[model samples]
Target: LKCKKLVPLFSKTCPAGKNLCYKMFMVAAPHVPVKRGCIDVCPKSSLLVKYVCCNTDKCN
Candidate 1:
């Protein structure tokens, strides 16, 4: 699968065996933070943060 990368703000192809991609966002005062990438196992979401996992190409 393909995913979004923050470093270059570009799309990247996931390594073999990796079939999932994720996007994470966190709540903060006067600021916004977000991240995206390939994930073997997506982390659980909580009150201050949230996660989205997907499977198609460039799904993150």
Candidate 2:
């Protein structure tokens, strides 16, 4: 079910202060458990990158 699994890439979870990221990338995972995020920050020079992809549960 994880043909193209890009899990928690560059992960994070900062509550009260912010910046929470759990970017779980999968076309079909755990009966389709898809929850993603990005508490981002890009400043003067700029540096925020994210590229992802996924296939299917055709996992037949």
Candidate 3:
């Protein structure tokens, strides 16, 4: 998926809001389809996929 390829690029910078990050990931993950990939690419380890949603509490 194109979104999967874009995951690394998306995660390269710090996001502005914790909820925004979560919402972004929740929306993006379905296209990318993998939590681990996002987690691996995220420097902050903020993209955790649990119960089908990305948790961004640690992003702060």
Candidate 4:
């Protein structure tokens, strides 16, 4: 089984106003080749893909 991992981090933070961090996940596995999805599926699109990995278990 293969899965992608995402990690989001923000520094200082924001007081007023909206932040846009769009993240798109495109699967490249053998089982599900054409399956595509987004990390943040909100109408505002305030999500970002900070990190991505196919074999997350092998990573530290």
Best by TM-score: 1
RMSD from true fold, candidate 4: 12.0
Off by over 4 Å in 1: 27-33
Residue 12 in model 4: lDDT: 26
User: TM-score per candidate, in order?
Assistant: 0.72, 0.20, 0.18, 0.16
lDDT of 1: 0.73
lDDT string, candidate 3, 1-60, tens digits = 112223444543333432222223343455643332223232432355432324443231
Q: State the lDDT at 23 in candidate 4.
A: 28
- State candidate 2's TM-score: 0.20
Give a tens-digit lDDT track for model 2, residues 7-59. 43443334453333333324434344354444333222213322232222212
Off by over 4 Å in 3: 1-10, 18-52, 56-60
lDDT of predicted model 2: 0.32
Tell me how candidate 3 scores on lDDT.
0.33
Top lDDT hit: 1
lDDT at residue 54 of model 3 (Cα atoms):
41
Clashes of each: 0, 0, 0, 1
- Model 4 residue runs over 4 Å out of place are 1-17, 29-60
**Alpha-carbon shift of residue 36 in model 1 (angstroms):** 0.7
